[PDB]
Design a binder for this molecule. Structure first.
Ligand SMILES: Cc1cc(SCc2[se]c(-c3ccc(C(F)(F)F)cc3)nc2C)ccc1OCC(=O)O
Ligand SMILES: Cc1cc(SCc2[se]c(-c3ccc(C(F)(F)F)cc3)nc2C)ccc1OCC(=O)O
Ligand SMILES: CCCCCCO[C@@H]1O[C@H](CO)[C@@H](O)[C@H](O)[C@H]1O
Ligand SMILES: CCCCCCO[C@@H]1O[C@H](CO)[C@@H](O)[C@H](O)[C@H]1O
Ligand SMILES: [Cl-]
Ligand SMILES: [Cl-]
Ligand SMILES: [K+]
Lengths: 262, 258
Protein backbone atom coordinates (compact mmCIF):
# COMPACT_ATOMS: atom_id res chain seq x y z
CA UNK A 1 0.00 0.00 0.00
CA UNK A 2 1.00 3.62 -0.64
CA UNK A 3 1.22 4.66 3.00
CA UNK A 4 0.84 8.41 2.39
CA UNK A 5 -2.35 8.01 0.35
CA UNK A 6 -3.58 5.44 2.89
CA UNK A 7 -3.10 7.88 5.78
CA UNK A 8 -4.71 10.81 3.98
CA UNK A 9 -7.71 8.57 3.27
CA UNK A 10 -8.15 7.75 6.97
CA UNK A 11 -7.57 11.43 7.82
CA UNK A 12 -10.41 12.47 5.51
CA UNK A 13 -12.75 9.78 6.88
CA UNK A 14 -11.97 11.16 10.35
CA UNK A 15 -12.79 14.74 9.33
CA UNK A 16 -15.95 13.58 7.57
CA UNK A 17 -17.31 11.62 10.56
CA UNK A 18 -16.24 13.50 13.72
CA UNK A 19 -17.79 16.95 13.99
CA UNK A 20 -15.61 18.11 16.91
CA UNK A 21 -11.97 17.83 15.86
CA UNK A 22 -9.04 18.62 18.12
CA UNK A 23 -8.38 21.64 15.89
CA UNK A 24 -11.87 23.03 16.51
CA UNK A 25 -11.81 22.13 20.20
CA UNK A 26 -8.47 23.85 20.80
CA UNK A 27 -9.57 27.08 19.11
CA UNK A 28 -12.64 27.14 21.39
CA UNK A 29 -10.66 26.33 24.53
CA UNK A 30 -8.25 29.20 23.73
CA UNK A 31 -10.95 31.69 22.70
CA UNK A 32 -10.77 32.23 18.93
CA UNK A 33 -13.59 33.96 17.05
CA UNK A 34 -19.16 32.30 20.91
CA UNK A 35 -17.50 31.13 24.12
CA UNK A 36 -18.82 28.02 25.89
CA UNK A 37 -21.33 28.33 28.71
CA UNK A 38 -19.59 27.16 31.88
CA UNK A 39 -21.44 24.42 33.78
CA UNK A 40 -20.08 24.34 37.33
CA UNK A 41 -23.04 23.73 39.67
CA UNK A 42 -26.73 22.82 39.73
CA UNK A 43 -27.96 26.26 38.74
CA UNK A 44 -25.72 26.53 35.67
CA UNK A 45 -26.44 22.94 34.66
CA UNK A 46 -30.15 23.72 34.81
CA UNK A 47 -29.61 26.89 32.77
CA UNK A 48 -27.48 25.01 30.25
CA UNK A 49 -30.25 22.43 29.99
CA UNK A 50 -32.91 25.06 29.30
CA UNK A 51 -31.27 26.61 26.25
CA UNK A 52 -27.96 28.21 27.21
CA UNK A 53 -26.46 24.98 25.80
CA UNK A 54 -28.90 22.20 24.87
CA UNK A 55 -35.20 12.30 26.02
CA UNK A 56 -33.36 11.33 29.20
CA UNK A 57 -34.97 9.67 32.22
CA UNK A 58 -36.87 11.92 34.66
CA UNK A 59 -34.54 14.15 36.63
CA UNK A 60 -33.94 12.62 40.06
CA UNK A 61 -30.59 14.04 41.14
CA UNK A 62 -27.54 15.81 39.79
CA UNK A 63 -25.11 12.87 39.90
CA UNK A 64 -27.45 10.54 37.98
CA UNK A 65 -28.41 13.21 35.47
CA UNK A 66 -24.71 13.66 34.65
CA UNK A 67 -24.33 9.87 34.48
CA UNK A 68 -27.09 9.80 31.83
CA UNK A 69 -25.52 12.68 29.94
CA UNK A 70 -22.30 10.61 29.82
CA UNK A 71 -24.18 7.67 28.31
CA UNK A 72 -25.86 9.76 25.63
CA UNK A 73 -22.47 11.21 24.70
CA UNK A 74 -20.86 7.80 24.33
CA UNK A 75 -23.78 6.33 22.35
CA UNK A 76 -23.50 9.19 19.83
CA UNK A 77 -19.76 8.61 19.50
CA UNK A 78 -20.37 4.91 18.88
CA UNK A 79 -22.43 6.01 15.86
CA UNK A 80 -19.61 8.21 14.57
CA UNK A 81 -16.97 5.52 15.17
CA UNK A 82 -19.07 2.96 13.28
CA UNK A 83 -19.24 5.23 10.23
CA UNK A 84 -15.53 6.08 10.56
CA UNK A 85 -14.53 2.42 10.71
CA UNK A 86 -16.61 1.59 7.63
CA UNK A 87 -14.31 4.00 5.73
CA UNK A 88 -11.08 2.30 6.83
CA UNK A 89 -9.64 0.26 3.91
CA UNK A 90 -10.80 -3.35 4.18
CA UNK A 91 -12.76 -2.89 7.43
CA UNK A 92 -15.97 -3.10 5.41
CA UNK A 93 -14.59 -6.22 3.70
CA UNK A 94 -14.82 -8.10 7.00
CA UNK A 95 -17.99 -10.03 7.69
CA UNK A 96 -20.41 -8.00 9.76
CA UNK A 97 -19.89 -10.12 12.88
CA UNK A 98 -16.17 -9.30 12.95
CA UNK A 99 -16.98 -5.62 12.42
CA UNK A 100 -19.20 -5.80 15.51
CA UNK A 101 -16.56 -7.59 17.55
CA UNK A 102 -13.97 -4.92 16.72
CA UNK A 103 -16.33 -2.06 17.56
CA UNK A 104 -17.65 -3.75 20.71
CA UNK A 105 -14.18 -4.11 22.23
CA UNK A 106 -12.63 -0.98 20.71
CA UNK A 107 -15.14 1.89 20.92
CA UNK A 108 -14.42 2.85 24.52
CA UNK A 109 -10.66 2.79 23.95
CA UNK A 110 -11.20 5.16 21.03
CA UNK A 111 -13.65 7.32 23.00
CA UNK A 112 -11.19 7.88 25.84
CA UNK A 113 -8.37 8.67 23.38
CA UNK A 114 -10.56 11.19 21.53
CA UNK A 115 -11.83 12.55 24.84
CA UNK A 116 -8.42 14.18 25.33
CA UNK A 117 -9.12 16.43 22.32
CA UNK A 118 -12.01 18.20 24.09
CA UNK A 119 -10.41 18.27 27.56
CA UNK A 120 -8.05 20.53 29.41
CA UNK A 121 -6.96 20.29 33.03
CA UNK A 122 -10.01 22.33 34.13
CA UNK A 123 -12.91 20.61 32.34
CA UNK A 124 -14.33 19.40 29.06
CA UNK A 125 -16.38 20.71 26.17
CA UNK A 126 -19.94 19.45 25.86
CA UNK A 127 -22.73 19.92 23.31
CA UNK A 128 -20.58 20.39 20.21
CA UNK A 129 -18.45 22.97 21.99
CA UNK A 130 -21.25 25.23 23.26
CA UNK A 131 -20.79 24.15 26.89
CA UNK A 132 -17.84 23.62 29.21
CA UNK A 133 -18.24 21.46 32.31
CA UNK A 134 -15.63 21.96 35.00
CA UNK A 135 -13.52 19.14 36.38
CA UNK A 136 -14.18 20.37 39.92
CA UNK A 137 -17.96 20.16 39.44
CA UNK A 138 -17.57 16.58 38.23
CA UNK A 139 -15.49 15.75 41.32
CA UNK A 140 -18.34 17.12 43.44
CA UNK A 141 -20.77 14.39 42.38
CA UNK A 142 -21.48 11.69 44.90
CA UNK A 143 -19.74 8.36 44.69
CA UNK A 144 -19.74 6.21 42.62
CA UNK A 145 -20.17 8.79 39.85
CA UNK A 146 -17.32 11.15 40.77
CA UNK A 147 -14.77 8.32 40.88
CA UNK A 148 -15.52 7.11 37.34
CA UNK A 149 -14.77 10.40 35.54
CA UNK A 150 -11.55 11.56 37.19
CA UNK A 151 -9.25 8.81 35.75
CA UNK A 152 -10.19 9.96 32.25
CA UNK A 153 -8.95 13.48 33.01
CA UNK A 154 -5.74 11.97 34.39
CA UNK A 155 -5.15 10.02 31.17
CA UNK A 156 -6.19 12.91 28.92
CA UNK A 157 -3.78 15.45 30.39
CA UNK A 158 -0.84 13.06 30.01
CA UNK A 159 -1.98 12.10 26.49
CA UNK A 160 -2.30 15.75 25.43
CA UNK A 161 1.33 16.33 26.38
CA UNK A 162 2.22 14.22 23.30
CA UNK A 163 0.73 17.05 21.20
CA UNK A 164 -0.90 14.92 18.52
CA UNK A 165 -2.98 16.60 15.83
CA UNK A 166 -6.06 15.31 14.05
CA UNK A 167 -4.00 13.67 11.29
CA UNK A 168 -2.12 11.67 13.94
CA UNK A 169 -5.28 10.81 15.84
CA UNK A 170 -7.09 9.49 12.77
CA UNK A 171 -4.44 6.79 12.35
CA UNK A 172 -4.25 6.20 16.11
CA UNK A 173 -8.00 5.61 16.35
CA UNK A 174 -7.99 3.33 13.31
CA UNK A 175 -5.21 1.27 14.93
CA UNK A 176 -7.28 0.92 18.11
CA UNK A 177 -10.31 -0.39 16.22
CA UNK A 178 -8.32 -2.76 13.96
CA UNK A 179 -7.09 -4.96 16.79
CA UNK A 180 -6.49 -8.66 16.19
CA UNK A 181 -6.54 -9.58 19.90
CA UNK A 182 -10.28 -9.02 20.49
CA UNK A 183 -12.24 -11.90 22.09
CA UNK A 184 -14.11 -14.11 19.65
CA UNK A 185 -12.75 -12.45 16.52
CA UNK A 186 -13.28 -14.71 13.51
CA UNK A 187 -10.75 -13.67 10.85
CA UNK A 188 -7.78 -12.83 13.07
CA UNK A 189 -5.15 -12.97 10.26
CA UNK A 190 -7.03 -10.41 8.17
CA UNK A 191 -7.51 -8.03 11.10
CA UNK A 192 -3.84 -8.42 12.07
CA UNK A 193 -2.80 -7.58 8.51
CA UNK A 194 -4.95 -4.44 8.35
CA UNK A 195 -3.62 -3.27 11.71
CA UNK A 196 -0.05 -3.74 10.57
CA UNK A 197 -0.69 -1.51 7.56
CA UNK A 198 -2.22 1.12 9.85
CA UNK A 199 0.74 0.95 12.24
CA UNK A 200 3.28 1.22 9.40
CA UNK A 201 1.31 4.20 8.08
CA UNK A 202 1.31 5.73 11.56
CA UNK A 203 5.06 5.30 12.00
CA UNK A 204 5.67 6.89 8.60
CA UNK A 205 3.21 9.71 9.28
CA UNK A 206 4.87 10.57 12.61
CA UNK A 207 8.34 10.73 11.06
CA UNK A 208 6.98 13.36 8.66
CA UNK A 209 4.67 15.23 11.04
CA UNK A 210 6.75 15.06 14.27
CA UNK A 211 10.35 14.91 13.00
CA UNK A 212 11.91 16.08 16.28
CA UNK A 213 9.58 14.06 18.57
CA UNK A 214 11.71 11.30 20.07
CA UNK A 215 10.21 7.87 20.81
CA UNK A 216 6.72 9.03 19.75
CA UNK A 217 5.65 5.81 18.01
CA UNK A 218 6.52 3.45 20.92
CA UNK A 219 4.96 5.96 23.29
CA UNK A 220 1.71 5.69 21.32
CA UNK A 221 1.89 1.89 21.39
CA UNK A 222 2.11 2.09 25.18
CA UNK A 223 -0.87 4.48 25.27
CA UNK A 224 -2.88 1.81 23.45
CA UNK A 225 -2.03 -0.64 26.25
CA UNK A 226 -2.84 2.07 28.82
CA UNK A 227 -6.26 2.59 27.23
CA UNK A 228 -7.05 -1.11 27.38
CA UNK A 229 -6.43 -1.00 31.13
CA UNK A 230 -8.45 2.21 31.46
CA UNK A 231 -11.39 0.48 29.79
CA UNK A 232 -11.14 -2.63 31.97
CA UNK A 233 -11.34 -0.45 35.07
CA UNK A 234 -14.15 1.60 33.58
CA UNK A 235 -16.16 -1.52 32.72
CA UNK A 236 -15.77 -2.78 36.28
CA UNK A 237 -17.01 0.53 37.71
CA UNK A 238 -19.99 0.52 35.36
CA UNK A 239 -20.88 -3.01 36.45
CA UNK A 240 -20.64 -2.05 40.13
CA UNK A 241 -22.97 0.89 39.50
CA UNK A 242 -25.39 -1.42 37.71
CA UNK A 243 -25.33 -3.71 40.77
CA UNK A 244 -25.54 -1.15 43.59
CA UNK A 245 -27.54 1.69 41.97
CA UNK A 246 -30.43 -0.57 41.02
CA UNK A 247 -32.68 2.43 40.27
CA UNK A 248 -30.37 3.89 37.59
CA UNK A 249 -30.64 2.67 34.01
CA UNK A 250 -27.97 1.62 31.52
CA UNK A 251 -28.53 2.33 27.85
CA UNK A 252 -29.19 -0.99 26.04
CA UNK A 253 -26.28 -0.55 23.61
CA UNK A 254 -23.89 -0.11 26.53
CA UNK A 255 -25.34 -3.20 28.23
CA UNK A 256 -24.50 -5.17 25.08
CA UNK A 257 -20.95 -3.79 25.10
CA UNK A 258 -20.35 -4.54 28.80
CA UNK A 259 -22.16 -7.90 28.79
CA UNK A 260 -19.16 -10.25 28.60
CA UNK A 261 -16.40 -8.06 30.03
CA UNK A 262 -14.81 -8.75 33.40
CA UNK B 1 -47.88 5.99 -2.79
CA UNK B 2 -44.95 6.44 -0.44
CA UNK B 3 -45.03 2.65 -0.19
CA UNK B 4 -44.56 2.46 -3.97
CA UNK B 5 -41.37 4.52 -3.73
CA UNK B 6 -40.25 2.45 -0.72
CA UNK B 7 -40.79 -0.72 -2.73
CA UNK B 8 -38.87 0.62 -5.73
CA UNK B 9 -35.92 1.39 -3.46
CA UNK B 10 -35.84 -2.16 -2.09
CA UNK B 11 -36.13 -3.54 -5.64
CA UNK B 12 -33.10 -1.47 -6.70
CA UNK B 13 -31.12 -2.78 -3.72
CA UNK B 14 -31.95 -6.30 -4.90
CA UNK B 15 -30.98 -5.64 -8.53
CA UNK B 16 -27.75 -4.00 -7.38
CA UNK B 17 -26.57 -6.76 -5.03
CA UNK B 18 -27.65 -10.25 -6.08
CA UNK B 19 -25.56 -12.08 -8.61
CA UNK B 20 -28.48 -14.04 -10.09
CA UNK B 21 -32.07 -12.85 -10.60
CA UNK B 22 -35.04 -15.17 -10.97
CA UNK B 23 -35.66 -13.67 -14.43
CA UNK B 24 -32.15 -14.66 -15.53
CA UNK B 25 -32.36 -18.07 -13.87
CA UNK B 26 -35.71 -19.01 -15.41
CA UNK B 27 -34.46 -18.14 -18.90
CA UNK B 28 -31.45 -20.42 -18.36
CA UNK B 29 -33.62 -23.24 -17.02
CA UNK B 30 -35.90 -23.06 -20.09
CA UNK B 31 -33.09 -23.06 -22.69
CA UNK B 32 -26.04 -20.29 -27.26
CA UNK B 33 -24.57 -22.28 -24.35
CA UNK B 34 -26.58 -24.48 -22.02
CA UNK B 35 -25.46 -25.22 -18.45
CA UNK B 36 -23.19 -28.21 -17.97
CA UNK B 37 -25.20 -31.01 -16.37
CA UNK B 38 -23.69 -32.59 -13.25
CA UNK B 39 -25.46 -35.91 -12.65
CA UNK B 40 -22.75 -38.35 -11.46
CA UNK B 41 -19.15 -38.53 -10.27
CA UNK B 42 -17.67 -38.30 -13.75
CA UNK B 43 -19.54 -35.12 -14.69
CA UNK B 44 -18.79 -33.52 -11.32
CA UNK B 45 -15.09 -34.05 -11.98
CA UNK B 46 -15.42 -32.53 -15.46
CA UNK B 47 -17.18 -29.54 -13.89
CA UNK B 48 -14.38 -29.08 -11.34
CA UNK B 49 -11.71 -29.39 -14.07
CA UNK B 50 -12.89 -26.13 -15.61
CA UNK B 51 -16.12 -27.08 -17.33
CA UNK B 52 -17.84 -24.98 -14.62
CA UNK B 53 -15.44 -23.87 -11.86
CA UNK B 54 -12.04 -25.96 -0.48
CA UNK B 55 -10.75 -28.53 2.04
CA UNK B 56 -8.85 -31.55 0.71
CA UNK B 57 -11.09 -33.90 -1.26
CA UNK B 58 -12.23 -36.81 0.92
CA UNK B 59 -15.31 -38.24 -0.85
CA UNK B 60 -18.12 -37.20 -3.18
CA UNK B 61 -20.84 -36.51 -0.62
CA UNK B 62 -18.52 -34.42 1.56
CA UNK B 63 -17.22 -32.55 -1.46
CA UNK B 64 -20.80 -31.56 -2.31
CA UNK B 65 -21.36 -30.60 1.34
CA UNK B 66 -18.39 -28.22 1.11
CA UNK B 67 -19.73 -26.71 -2.10
CA UNK B 68 -23.06 -26.15 -0.32
CA UNK B 69 -21.16 -24.26 2.38
CA UNK B 70 -19.25 -22.12 -0.11
CA UNK B 71 -22.50 -21.25 -1.87
CA UNK B 72 -24.11 -20.29 1.44
CA UNK B 73 -21.23 -18.04 2.51
CA UNK B 74 -21.37 -16.24 -0.83
CA UNK B 75 -25.10 -15.61 -0.47
CA UNK B 76 -24.54 -14.27 3.06
CA UNK B 77 -22.20 -11.70 1.48
CA UNK B 78 -24.87 -10.70 -1.04
CA UNK B 79 -27.64 -10.57 1.56
CA UNK B 80 -25.45 -8.42 3.80
CA UNK B 81 -24.95 -5.93 0.98
CA UNK B 82 -28.64 -6.11 0.05
CA UNK B 83 -29.69 -5.27 3.61
CA UNK B 84 -27.09 -2.49 3.88
CA UNK B 85 -28.58 -0.98 0.70
CA UNK B 86 -31.88 -0.63 2.62
CA UNK B 87 -31.64 2.71 4.48
CA UNK B 88 -33.81 1.74 7.45
CA UNK B 89 -31.62 -1.35 7.97
CA UNK B 90 -28.36 0.60 7.78
CA UNK B 91 -29.71 3.00 10.42
CA UNK B 92 -29.83 0.28 13.09
CA UNK B 93 -26.83 -0.14 15.33
CA UNK B 94 -24.40 -2.66 13.88
CA UNK B 95 -25.15 -5.28 16.55
CA UNK B 96 -28.83 -5.34 15.59
CA UNK B 97 -27.79 -5.61 11.93
CA UNK B 98 -25.74 -8.71 12.80
CA UNK B 99 -28.58 -10.20 14.86
CA UNK B 100 -31.05 -9.81 11.97
CA UNK B 101 -28.61 -11.34 9.47
CA UNK B 102 -27.55 -14.14 11.82
CA UNK B 103 -31.14 -15.34 12.31
CA UNK B 104 -32.52 -14.37 8.89
CA UNK B 105 -29.99 -15.40 6.24
CA UNK B 106 -30.93 -19.07 6.03
CA UNK B 107 -34.64 -18.26 5.68
CA UNK B 108 -33.74 -15.85 2.92
CA UNK B 109 -31.31 -18.32 1.30
CA UNK B 110 -33.95 -21.04 1.09
CA UNK B 111 -36.54 -18.63 -0.34
CA UNK B 112 -34.10 -17.39 -2.99
CA UNK B 113 -32.98 -20.94 -3.75
CA UNK B 114 -36.39 -21.52 -5.36
CA UNK B 115 -35.40 -19.04 -8.09
CA UNK B 116 -32.61 -21.32 -9.37
CA UNK B 117 -34.49 -24.63 -8.89
CA UNK B 118 -36.92 -26.72 -10.87
CA UNK B 119 -38.25 -30.19 -10.11
CA UNK B 120 -35.21 -31.72 -11.83
CA UNK B 121 -32.27 -29.88 -10.24
CA UNK B 122 -30.63 -26.56 -9.53
CA UNK B 123 -28.30 -24.06 -11.14
CA UNK B 124 -24.74 -23.75 -9.88
CA UNK B 125 -21.72 -21.57 -10.66
CA UNK B 126 -23.70 -18.51 -11.75
CA UNK B 127 -25.87 -20.65 -14.01
CA UNK B 128 -23.07 -22.35 -15.93
CA UNK B 129 -23.80 -25.72 -14.30
CA UNK B 130 -26.95 -27.66 -13.42
CA UNK B 131 -26.84 -30.35 -10.72
CA UNK B 132 -29.62 -32.93 -10.90
CA UNK B 133 -31.92 -33.60 -7.99
CA UNK B 134 -31.48 -37.33 -8.67
CA UNK B 135 -27.71 -37.03 -8.22
CA UNK B 136 -28.15 -35.17 -4.93
CA UNK B 137 -30.49 -37.95 -3.78
CA UNK B 138 -27.72 -40.47 -4.53
CA UNK B 139 -25.27 -39.04 -1.97
CA UNK B 140 -24.89 -40.92 1.25
CA UNK B 141 -26.77 -39.97 4.35
CA UNK B 142 -26.66 -37.53 6.04
CA UNK B 143 -25.92 -35.36 2.98
CA UNK B 144 -28.79 -36.41 0.68
CA UNK B 145 -31.43 -35.99 3.41
CA UNK B 146 -30.61 -32.35 4.13
CA UNK B 147 -30.97 -31.24 0.48
CA UNK B 148 -34.28 -32.86 -0.56
CA UNK B 149 -36.65 -30.82 1.71
CA UNK B 150 -35.41 -27.68 -0.04
CA UNK B 151 -36.54 -28.97 -3.44
CA UNK B 152 -39.91 -29.86 -1.94
CA UNK B 153 -40.30 -26.33 -0.58
CA UNK B 154 -39.05 -24.70 -3.79
CA UNK B 155 -41.41 -26.45 -6.19
CA UNK B 156 -44.44 -25.39 -4.11
CA UNK B 157 -43.01 -21.88 -3.67
CA UNK B 158 -42.40 -21.47 -7.42
CA UNK B 159 -46.06 -22.35 -8.09
CA UNK B 160 -46.88 -18.89 -6.63
CA UNK B 161 -45.05 -17.37 -9.63
CA UNK B 162 -43.42 -14.48 -7.80
CA UNK B 163 -41.10 -12.24 -9.81
CA UNK B 164 -37.95 -10.41 -8.71
CA UNK B 165 -39.82 -7.29 -7.62
CA UNK B 166 -42.06 -9.40 -5.34
CA UNK B 167 -39.07 -11.32 -3.99
CA UNK B 168 -37.13 -8.18 -3.12
CA UNK B 169 -39.90 -7.21 -0.68
CA UNK B 170 -40.38 -10.79 0.52
CA UNK B 171 -36.67 -11.16 1.35
CA UNK B 172 -36.57 -7.73 3.01
CA UNK B 173 -39.49 -8.83 5.22
CA UNK B 174 -37.61 -11.98 6.21
CA UNK B 175 -34.52 -10.03 7.30
CA UNK B 176 -36.40 -7.20 9.07
CA UNK B 177 -37.93 -9.53 11.67
CA UNK B 178 -38.63 -8.16 15.14
CA UNK B 179 -38.83 -11.63 16.71
CA UNK B 180 -35.11 -12.59 16.53
CA UNK B 181 -33.29 -13.59 19.75
CA UNK B 182 -31.26 -10.85 21.40
CA UNK B 183 -32.52 -8.01 19.22
CA UNK B 184 -31.96 -4.64 20.87
CA UNK B 185 -34.38 -2.18 19.20
CA UNK B 186 -37.37 -4.48 18.73
CA UNK B 187 -40.00 -1.72 18.24
CA UNK B 188 -37.91 -0.09 15.51
CA UNK B 189 -37.43 -3.37 13.61
CA UNK B 190 -41.13 -4.14 14.10
CA UNK B 191 -42.02 -0.74 12.62
CA UNK B 192 -39.79 -1.34 9.57
CA UNK B 193 -41.20 -4.83 9.02
CA UNK B 194 -44.77 -3.59 9.14
CA UNK B 195 -43.87 -0.95 6.54
CA UNK B 196 -42.33 -3.63 4.33
CA UNK B 197 -45.39 -5.87 4.73
CA UNK B 198 -47.76 -3.02 3.82
CA UNK B 199 -45.65 -2.18 0.76
CA UNK B 200 -45.73 -5.86 -0.25
CA UNK B 201 -49.52 -6.00 0.17
CA UNK B 202 -49.94 -3.09 -2.22
CA UNK B 203 -47.26 -4.37 -4.59
CA UNK B 204 -49.07 -7.70 -4.97
CA UNK B 205 -52.37 -5.97 -5.73
CA UNK B 206 -50.63 -3.99 -8.48
CA UNK B 207 -48.43 -6.81 -9.83
CA UNK B 208 -50.74 -9.84 -9.35
CA UNK B 209 -54.26 -8.38 -9.53
CA UNK B 210 -55.86 -11.76 -10.26
CA UNK B 211 -53.94 -13.84 -7.68
CA UNK B 212 -56.41 -14.50 -4.87
CA UNK B 213 -55.09 -14.72 -1.29
CA UNK B 214 -51.46 -14.34 -2.41
CA UNK B 215 -50.44 -12.10 0.49
CA UNK B 216 -51.61 -14.44 3.29
CA UNK B 217 -50.09 -17.33 1.33
CA UNK B 218 -46.73 -15.54 1.49
CA UNK B 219 -47.12 -14.91 5.23
CA UNK B 220 -47.61 -18.64 5.58
CA UNK B 221 -44.51 -19.29 3.43
CA UNK B 222 -42.54 -17.10 5.86
CA UNK B 223 -43.75 -19.35 8.67
CA UNK B 224 -42.85 -22.45 6.63
CA UNK B 225 -39.33 -21.11 6.07
CA UNK B 226 -38.81 -20.70 9.81
CA UNK B 227 -39.71 -24.37 10.25
CA UNK B 228 -37.54 -25.42 7.31
CA UNK B 229 -34.57 -23.67 8.93
CA UNK B 230 -35.29 -25.26 12.31
CA UNK B 231 -35.17 -28.68 10.67
CA UNK B 232 -32.08 -27.68 8.66
CA UNK B 233 -30.24 -26.61 11.81
CA UNK B 234 -31.11 -29.91 13.51
CA UNK B 235 -29.67 -31.82 10.55
CA UNK B 236 -26.54 -29.65 10.63
CA UNK B 237 -26.23 -30.44 14.34
CA UNK B 238 -26.32 -34.16 13.56
CA UNK B 239 -23.66 -33.72 10.88
CA UNK B 240 -21.42 -31.90 13.37
CA UNK B 241 -21.96 -34.76 15.83
CA UNK B 242 -21.64 -37.76 13.49
CA UNK B 243 -19.30 -36.55 10.68
CA UNK B 244 -16.34 -35.54 12.82
CA UNK B 245 -13.93 -35.48 9.86
CA UNK B 246 -15.93 -32.82 7.98
CA UNK B 247 -15.18 -29.16 8.56
CA UNK B 248 -17.62 -26.29 8.95
CA UNK B 249 -16.81 -22.85 7.58
CA UNK B 250 -16.06 -20.40 10.43
CA UNK B 251 -18.83 -17.97 9.44
CA UNK B 252 -21.36 -20.78 9.50
CA UNK B 253 -20.03 -21.86 12.90
CA UNK B 254 -20.84 -18.36 14.20
CA UNK B 255 -24.31 -18.47 12.64
CA UNK B 256 -25.07 -21.85 14.27
CA UNK B 257 -23.33 -21.00 17.56
CA UNK B 258 -26.71 -21.40 19.36
C1 LIG C 1 -20.32 7.23 33.38
C2 LIG C 1 -19.32 7.43 32.23
C3 LIG C 1 -18.23 8.24 32.43
C4 LIG C 1 -17.32 8.44 31.41
S1 LIG C 1 -15.87 9.51 31.70
C5 LIG C 1 -15.60 10.51 30.20
C6 LIG C 1 -16.79 11.45 29.95
SE1 LIG C 1 -17.58 12.66 31.16
C7 LIG C 1 -18.85 13.26 29.92
C8 LIG C 1 -19.91 14.31 30.24
C9 LIG C 1 -19.92 14.81 31.53
C10 LIG C 1 -20.84 15.76 31.92
C11 LIG C 1 -21.77 16.21 31.00
C12 LIG C 1 -22.78 17.26 31.45
F1 LIG C 1 -22.27 17.98 32.50
F2 LIG C 1 -23.05 18.09 30.41
F3 LIG C 1 -23.93 16.66 31.87
C13 LIG C 1 -21.77 15.72 29.70
C14 LIG C 1 -20.84 14.77 29.32
N1 LIG C 1 -18.62 12.56 28.76
C15 LIG C 1 -17.56 11.62 28.75
C16 LIG C 1 -17.23 10.80 27.50
C17 LIG C 1 -17.51 7.84 30.17
C18 LIG C 1 -18.61 7.02 29.97
C19 LIG C 1 -19.52 6.83 31.00
O1 LIG C 1 -20.64 6.01 30.80
C20 LIG C 1 -20.97 5.80 29.46
C21 LIG C 1 -20.21 4.55 28.94
O2 LIG C 1 -19.62 3.76 29.73
O3 LIG C 1 -20.18 4.33 27.71
C1 LIG D 1 -25.41 -28.67 3.66
C2 LIG D 1 -26.34 -27.55 3.20
C3 LIG D 1 -27.36 -27.84 2.34
C4 LIG D 1 -28.21 -26.83 1.92
S1 LIG D 1 -29.56 -27.28 0.78
C5 LIG D 1 -29.67 -25.92 -0.43
C6 LIG D 1 -28.42 -25.96 -1.32
SE1 LIG D 1 -27.78 -27.41 -2.34
C7 LIG D 1 -26.31 -26.43 -3.00
C8 LIG D 1 -25.28 -27.03 -3.94
C9 LIG D 1 -25.48 -28.36 -4.26
C10 LIG D 1 -24.60 -29.01 -5.10
C11 LIG D 1 -23.53 -28.32 -5.62
C12 LIG D 1 -22.59 -29.07 -6.55
F1 LIG D 1 -23.12 -30.29 -6.86
F2 LIG D 1 -22.44 -28.35 -7.69
F3 LIG D 1 -21.38 -29.29 -5.96
C13 LIG D 1 -23.33 -26.98 -5.31
C14 LIG D 1 -24.21 -26.32 -4.47
N1 LIG D 1 -26.38 -25.19 -2.44
C15 LIG D 1 -27.47 -24.91 -1.56
C16 LIG D 1 -27.65 -23.54 -0.90
C17 LIG D 1 -28.02 -25.52 2.37
C18 LIG D 1 -26.97 -25.23 3.24
C19 LIG D 1 -26.13 -26.26 3.65
O1 LIG D 1 -25.07 -26.06 4.54
C20 LIG D 1 -24.56 -24.77 4.67
C21 LIG D 1 -25.37 -24.03 5.73
O2 LIG D 1 -26.27 -24.61 6.41
O3 LIG D 1 -25.10 -22.82 5.92
C1 LIG E 1 -23.55 -10.93 8.67
C2 LIG E 1 -23.80 -12.36 9.14
C3 LIG E 1 -23.05 -12.69 10.46
C4 LIG E 1 -23.54 -14.05 11.03
C5 LIG E 1 -22.64 -14.56 12.17
C6 LIG E 1 -22.93 -13.83 13.49
O1 LIG E 1 -22.39 -14.55 14.58
C7 LIG E 1 -22.47 -13.89 15.78
O2 LIG E 1 -21.53 -12.78 15.79
C8 LIG E 1 -21.53 -12.06 17.08
C9 LIG E 1 -20.43 -11.06 17.03
O3 LIG E 1 -20.87 -10.08 16.14
C10 LIG E 1 -21.29 -12.98 18.28
O4 LIG E 1 -21.53 -12.20 19.47
C11 LIG E 1 -22.19 -14.15 18.25
O5 LIG E 1 -21.82 -15.05 19.33
C12 LIG E 1 -22.14 -14.84 16.94
O6 LIG E 1 -23.08 -15.92 16.88
C1 LIG F 1 -21.24 -1.20 16.93
C2 LIG F 1 -21.25 -1.37 18.44
C3 LIG F 1 -21.93 -2.67 18.94
C4 LIG F 1 -21.60 -2.93 20.43
C5 LIG F 1 -22.55 -3.98 21.03
C6 LIG F 1 -22.16 -5.42 20.62
O1 LIG F 1 -22.93 -6.31 21.39
C7 LIG F 1 -22.90 -7.61 20.98
O2 LIG F 1 -23.79 -7.77 19.84
C8 LIG F 1 -23.86 -9.17 19.36
C9 LIG F 1 -24.94 -9.22 18.33
O3 LIG F 1 -24.39 -8.65 17.17
C10 LIG F 1 -24.20 -10.16 20.48
O4 LIG F 1 -24.05 -11.50 19.99
C11 LIG F 1 -23.33 -9.97 21.66
O5 LIG F 1 -23.83 -10.86 22.70
C12 LIG F 1 -23.32 -8.55 22.12
O6 LIG F 1 -22.37 -8.39 23.19
CL1 LIG G 1 -4.49 19.08 28.69
CL1 LIG H 1 -29.84 -20.45 12.93
K1 LIG I 1 -40.24 -25.24 -10.08
Amino acid sequence: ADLKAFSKHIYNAYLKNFNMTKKKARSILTGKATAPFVIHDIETLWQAEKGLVWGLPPYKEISVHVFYRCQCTTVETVRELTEFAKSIPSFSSLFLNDQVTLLKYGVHEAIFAMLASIVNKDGLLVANGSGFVTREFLRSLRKPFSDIIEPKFEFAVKFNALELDDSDLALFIAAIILCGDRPGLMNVPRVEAIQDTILRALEFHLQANHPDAQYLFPKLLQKMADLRQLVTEHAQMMQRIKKTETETSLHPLLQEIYKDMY
